[PDB]
């Protein structure tokens, strides 16, 4: 990994820096606020 | 750090970011000059002993 | 993405609530980082990465 980071296949004796911490992205998850007050189509399929 | 900080949780930026160069690679190594300098001036002012 | 709230990060509990009039939560980067959930009555931390 500090190979790649240097772009040389050999490195010093010391500390250096890579990439920081991040979490892969796994999956996707969507919600809304739930269903509520529901438009009239009952009486307009099942009409008298 | 230069990914994560312009681009937050956006991994098509990663693709974007390289293309540019070496900017990072100075940018980083610009920064590690002021951040191993302080380190330099703590010991010149306090352990001539 | 809380209808319409894109974005990638992981979710914690927080122990803070909210008013019944807010919906949402920013921060110093003017961005979304604590929000009511949609569909259920509580506060949820967005923790970034
Ligand atoms: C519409 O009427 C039919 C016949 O009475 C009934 O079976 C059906 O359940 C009704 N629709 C709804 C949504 O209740
Ligand atoms: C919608 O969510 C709220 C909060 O959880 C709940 O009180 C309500 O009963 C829900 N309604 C339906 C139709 O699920």
């Given at each position: 990994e500090t190979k790649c980071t240097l772009k040389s296949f050999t490195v010093e004796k010391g500390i250096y820096q890579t990439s920081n911490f991040r979490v892969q992205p796994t999956e996707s998850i969507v919600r809304f606020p739930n269903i509520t007050n529901?438009?009239?189509?009952d009486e307009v399929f099942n009409a008298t | 750090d230069c990914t994560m900080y312009?681009?937050?949780?956006?991994?098509e930026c990663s693709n974007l970011l390289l293309?540019?160069?070496?900017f990072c690679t100075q940018l980083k190594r610009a920064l590690t000059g002021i951040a191993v300098e302080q380190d330099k001036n703590t010991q010149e002012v306090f352990a001539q002993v | 993405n809380f209808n319409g709230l894109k974005g990638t990060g992981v979710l914690t509990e927080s122990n803070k609530k909210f008013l019944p009039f807010q919906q949402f939560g920013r921060d110093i980067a003017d961005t979304t980082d604590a929000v009511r959930d949609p569909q259920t009555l509580e506060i949820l931390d967005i923790t970034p990465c």
């Amino acid at each position: 990994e500090t190979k790649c980071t240097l772009k040389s296949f050999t490195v010093e004796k010391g500390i250096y820096q890579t990439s920081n911490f991040r979490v892969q992205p796994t999956e996707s998850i969507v919600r809304f606020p739930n269903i509520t007050n529901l438009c009239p189509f009952d009486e307009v399929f099942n009409a008298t | 750090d230069c990914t994560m900080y312009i681009c937050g949780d956006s991994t098509e930026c990663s693709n974007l970011l390289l293309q540019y160069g070496s900017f990072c690679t100075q940018l980083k190594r610009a920064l590690t000059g002021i951040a191993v300098e302080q380190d330099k001036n703590t010991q010149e002012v306090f352990a001539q002993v | 993405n809380f209808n319409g709230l894109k974005g990638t990060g992981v979710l914690t509990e927080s122990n803070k609530k909210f008013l019944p009039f807010q919906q949402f939560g920013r921060d110093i980067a003017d961005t979304t980082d604590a929000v009511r959930d949609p569909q259920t009555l509580e506060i949820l931390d967005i923790t970034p990465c």
